Write an enzyme that holds these catalytic residues in place. Structure first.
Site, short mmCIF file in Angstrom:
data_model
loop_
_atom_site.label_atom_id
_atom_site.label_comp_id
_atom_site.label_asym_id
_atom_site.label_seq_id
_atom_site.Cartn_x
_atom_site.Cartn_y
_atom_site.Cartn_z
N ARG A 23 -10.67 16.51 61.94
CA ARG A 23 -11.80 16.45 61.10
C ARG A 23 -10.78 16.32 60.05
NH1 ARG A 23 -13.64 21.91 60.32
NH2 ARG A 23 -14.81 20.72 61.97
N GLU A 34 -11.06 21.98 79.13
CA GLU A 34 -11.82 23.51 79.94
C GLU A 34 -11.74 23.99 80.83
OE1 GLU A 34 -12.31 26.55 78.52
OE2 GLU A 34 -13.53 26.45 79.63
N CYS A 44 -19.55 36.29 72.99
CA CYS A 44 -20.56 37.66 72.25
C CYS A 44 -21.59 37.84 72.44
CB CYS A 44 -19.97 37.83 70.55
SG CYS A 44 -18.26 36.08 70.02
#
Ligand SMILES: Cc1cc2nc3c(=O)[nH]c(=O)nc-3n(C[C@H](O)[C@H](O)[C@H](O)COP(=O)(O)OP(=O)(O)OC[C@H]3O[C@@H](n4cnc5c(N)ncnc54)[C@H](O)[C@@H]3O)c2cc1C
Ligand SMILES: Cc1cc2nc3c(=O)[nH]c(=O)nc-3n(C[C@H](O)[C@H](O)[C@H](O)COP(=O)(O)OP(=O)(O)OC[C@H]3O[C@@H](n4cnc5c(N)ncnc54)[C@H](O)[C@@H]3O)c2cc1C
Ligand SMILES: *SCCNC(=O)CCNC(=O)[C@H](O)C(C)(C)COP(=O)(O)OP(=O)(O)OC[C@H]1O[C@@H](n2cnc3c(N)ncnc32)[C@H](O)[C@@H]1OP(=O)(O)O
Ligand SMILES: *SCCNC(=O)CCNC(=O)[C@H](O)C(C)(C)COP(=O)(O)OP(=O)(O)OC[C@H]1O[C@@H](n2cnc3c(N)ncnc32)[C@H](O)[C@@H]1OP(=O)(O)O
Ligand SMILES: NC(=O)c1ccc[n+]([C@@H]2O[C@H](COP(=O)([O-])OP(=O)(O)OC[C@H]3O[C@@H](n4cnc5c(N)ncnc54)[C@H](O)[C@@H]3O)[C@@H](O)[C@H]2O)c1
Ligand SMILES: NC(=O)c1ccc[n+]([C@@H]2O[C@H](COP(=O)([O-])OP(=O)(O)OC[C@H]3O[C@@H](n4cnc5c(N)ncnc54)[C@H](O)[C@@H]3O)[C@@H](O)[C@H]2O)c1
Lengths: 443, 443
Positions: A23, A34, A44
């Site tokens: 950005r 990944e 979480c």
């Protein structure tokens, strides 16, 4: 310039860095490898999916690899970077797809490999209904087991785990919590651990303390858990015994580890190698109370790492200035929040410290519905310097813990806290805020 | 020593001073003359009694004149001190009971006479169903009127009033709110005023803006309210148009008033006369942003004034160090909190000020039930110095405003706010806290 930024690990540290970098400087070639085949999701939130309150696991994902692609970021899942030709001196990345393996180069590398569960050496761990809660895959596994109860044993009474126990209960299982130290949330002073035992018991959870778990009985299935204190029967056991950072690839490439065992960094998230950054659960942060490096694997601190590395790379000026240790979690009807040092640890550190622990309300005495609110202050005897604090409430919340984090940040004394002009109205706090009544002020 | 402390007014500023003095030095003879026949009660709770959520009005009283007696404090209700033979030179108190009138001396005098509602000059105000909301007696009047609806008009869209509209609706009346300025809560930047109009309307309150109320129609009863914009029929009207301090007795005796109109004080709550203190809504406080005296009639500041005067009198060391303007209230399903200056006011002071106003959630996107949370930051262009802030939430809980009050207290910049280690967990805030996202950080 228009160079190539390679991020190793796409969860939170890594996804932050990737997104902010692109950005801030669209000239950059941004690519994330990944290994887990999910990227950018809220670990979480796992216990809220387990419990059933959140319908489907995909609800935890913040950005999909498709949305990333639309925003000029290339993410590859199930790609493991296996070696880096560091310094040494780039090529470097050899990573592995479905089928193949291959090379890639980098100009900026962000190591965001995270952390894995640290299992205790216990015969039987290898069997069938033993689990771990760290990734979306662990989520799928447990979610499959869960319907079809029946009896769960959770080793460890820290965050995952206190959180898990609530999830399991809400799913019907009967749950017994086995902790090796003498209270739940052993890591903090013990007034809090007490309140927590009470809530867990109030909800049907049995909490064994001081337990020496000896082995997980079965013929590759698990039905038991034999302990020094007796035998807990169980057809699902969750190991919730701590995490350690994934520093393995980084060491291979000659990145330095700091004293905690996580990768060392500066205010710029830079490692000891030019070009190499680290972000998230793999990385040390500077602790502002202890004035040294410290390991604080929370998701907000992983986003802050990410965003800094990313900014720095895109050539914006950005620095990460440390943490103080603020944490909050929900266990049933308690919201428990700590920050700074507890009195135990403040004395381990050598301070001449004292604590104060008060119980007050979260709204006027007269106001309908107002519940309890407890606040602890850990401070230096003579100076009055704050060093830590907790507040526990039912509140969504309180969260007044943030005021203490603000004071810890500068040096900040009990006297400073006393002087604060806090907010008062009958629905929200008593006319003296629990932080103020704790201050100096009662014992 | 063991001299005589006389407190004029027993509501909050006065009751605090009485109780803390007596605690801190029991030798003192402590007597409170309260003219209203109720003492030590939470005026802030009145709208909750009006609405029916709190059963009986006596629930709002903190200490009864009997419990005070037990603790060594003599309270006389329905006693109005009518003159003071100051300096001049004591005697001084002449005050008035049931029947009689009489003298009393003092060594320490605490002026704690509070504030009265400031009525606008509108013919017809004197009629029968026109009310004001400040005291327990006002409570009783209103509580008598209320069952037997039907149509209410509230002049004034500030705090009493926004709060009253909720009460009256919960009691079934149809309510229409008339404000003179262009938004509700006109005294703050207009994004908040907007969120408030939308909620009031969502709950069936009609809000007229820019209204010139011209007279209350009736033959001594009231049935109408004639305005520049039309005619509101109404059989109960609440005048919620502001308060002014009760400085009248104090001026007689030659106590100085500050530029705001309230009694002037130092950090020890002392007036210009030796022996004479002021506490609560009749007293100015030092504003720490504006760096001058300021009038902030809130009840937490009234207890702080009173506790200080009392301590100082008993011979303890205590100083009152100021306010910053923190306020929070509940209006239906919004909790609205402000602190510091608004952009409007910050500019009127001359700063080169800017605002930012963001809307975020109160808990992770994926967390079930997480609601919206808006935060506003008002800062100085170059320095980045914070100057004021708002947060609005449904939360019982947020209240994050307290953080900005901590920052306002020292000088505290957006950069400072950015560096804070706030608490994160999915039930409570998103991984970037809304205070952080508002810092610098988005527009
Ligand atoms: C059940 C649960 C509840 C939680 N609740 C909270 C909370 O309430 N509040 C809070 O602040 N924090 C919470 N956390 C913490 C949070 O998960 C982490 O702090 C956060 O996700 C930041 O991690 P990260 O991006 O550095 O790496 P991680 O999220 O650990 O991700 C690292 C990823 O990188 C990948 N990777 C590793 N090695 C390689 C390699 N060699 N090549 C390629 N890829 C690789 C791994 O596959 C892994 O998926 C919770 C965690 C869990 C598990
Ligand atoms: C409806 C309502 C809602 C509120 N909600 C909030 C809130 O949400 N948060 C918040 O912080 N604050 C709130 N307040 C403000 C709060 O009422 C005052 O700030 C608080 O009670 C402090 O007042 P004080 O003790 O100086 O005097 P007051 O409470 O005004 O009491 C003064 C008393 O002194 C007596 N007196 C005056 N003159 C004489 C005399 N000459 N002789 C003898 N006695 C005398 C008067 O009878 C009066 O009863 C609210 C107030 C009202 C009315
Ligand atoms: S357990 C770990 C917690 N969960 C995770 O961290 C995993 C999911 N999160 C991530 O992986 C990353 O945080 C992602 C989403 C991949 C990275 O996202 P971005 O860096 O793109 O973040 P955003 O698009 O959310 O925010 C970027 C800019 O947008 C501004 N902003 C956010 N929210 C608001 C609101 N509500 N109102 C106004 N503006 C808002 C931020 O200030 C930020 O500002 P820039 O200055 O443009 O970067
Ligand atoms: S709209 C205005 C709001 N409502 C009002 O203010 C009107 C009602 N309030 C009052 O009139 C005064 O505040 C009264 C109650 C008359 C004055 O009360 P005290 O000064 O006697 O107040 P308390 O007895 O509440 O507190 C005195 C000491 O007790 C300690 N303390 C309070 N609450 C706790 C808890 N939950 N746990 C531990 N200690 C607590 C205070 O710290 C205070 O300490 P000292 O150092 O002993 O004065
Ligand atoms: N709300 C939050 O802020 C939150 C919530 C969940 C997870 N997280 C992040 O992820 C991390 C996960 O923590 P966690 O709960 O896995 O570890 P932890 O270190 O917080 O655990 C405390 C430990 O006492 C130790 N213990 C008890 N029995 C044991 C046994 N039989 N053998 C060995 N040890 C035993 C436990 O293992 C238990 O883990 C957190 O520290 C946090 O960084 C954060
Ligand atoms: N939660 C809280 O913090 C809280 C809540 C209630 C009261 N209080 C305390 O008591 C005080 C009471 O405030 P308030 O609501 O009476 O006053 P205010 O000054 O806050 O009110 C704003 C004003 O715009 C003015 N206005 C609208 N129509 C008018 C008209 N037709 N003629 C004249 N003025 C008009 C209104 O009069 C309205 O009062 C608060 O400022 C506060 O000190 C605090």
């Amino acid at each position: 310039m228009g160079k190539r930024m390679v991020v190793v690990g796409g969860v939170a540290g890594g996804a932050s860095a990737a997104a902010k970098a692109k950005r801030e400087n669209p000239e950059l070639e941004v690519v994330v490898y990944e290994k887990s085949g999910w990227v950018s999701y809220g670990a979480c939130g796992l216990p809220y999916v387990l419990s059933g309150e959140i319908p489907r696991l995909e609800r935890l994902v913040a950005r999909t690899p498709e949305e990333f692609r639309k925003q000029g970021v290339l993410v590859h899942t199930r790609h493991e970077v296996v070696d880096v030709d560091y310094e040494l001196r780039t090529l470097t990345v050899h990573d592995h797809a479905e089928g193949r393996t291959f090379q890639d180069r980098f100009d900026h590398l962000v190591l965001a490999t995270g952390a894995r569960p640290s299992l205790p050496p216990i015969p039987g761990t290898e069997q069938e209904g033993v689990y771990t809660l760290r990734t979306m895959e662990d989520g799928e596994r447990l979610l499959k087991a869960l319907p079809q109860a029946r009896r769960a044993a959770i080793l460890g009474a820290g965050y995952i785990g206190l959180e898990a126990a609530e999830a399991f209960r809400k799913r019907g299982l009967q749950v017994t919590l086995l902790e090796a130290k003498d209270r739940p949330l052993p890591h903090w002073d013990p007034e809090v651990g007490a309140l927590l035992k009470e809530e867990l018991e109030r909800h049907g959870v049995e909490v064994w303390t001081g337990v020496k778990v000896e082995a997980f009985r079965g013929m590759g299935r698990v039905e038991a858990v034999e302990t020094s204190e007796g035998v807990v029967p169980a057809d699902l056991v969750l190991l919730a015994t701590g995490i350690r950072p994934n520093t393995e690839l980084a060491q291979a490439m000659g990145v330095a580890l700091g004293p905690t065992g996580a990768i060392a960094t500066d205010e710029r998230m830079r490692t000891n190698l030019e070009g190499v950054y680290a972000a998230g659960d793999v990385a040390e942060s500077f602790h502002r109370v202890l004035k040294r490096p410290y390991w604080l694997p929370l998701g907000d601190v992983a986003n802050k790492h990410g965003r800094t590395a990313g900014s720095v790379i895109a050539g914006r000026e950005a620095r990460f200035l440390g943490v103080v240790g603020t944490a909050i979690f929900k266990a049933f009807d308690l919201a428990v929040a700590t920050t700074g040092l507890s009195l135990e640890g403040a004395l381990k550190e050598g301070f001449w410290a004292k604590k104060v622990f008060i119980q007050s309300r979260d709204g006027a005495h007269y106001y309908p519905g107002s519940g309890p609110l407890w606040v602890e202050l850990v401070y230096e005897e003579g100076t009055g310097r704050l060093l830590g604090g907790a507040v526990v409430a039912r509140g969504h919340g309180a969260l007044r813990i943030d005021v203490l984090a603000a004071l810890l940040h500068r040096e900040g004394s009990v006297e400073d806290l006393l002087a604060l002009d806090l907010a008062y109205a009958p629905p929200f706090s008593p006319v003296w805020d629990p932080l103020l009544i704790a201050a100096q002020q009662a014992r």
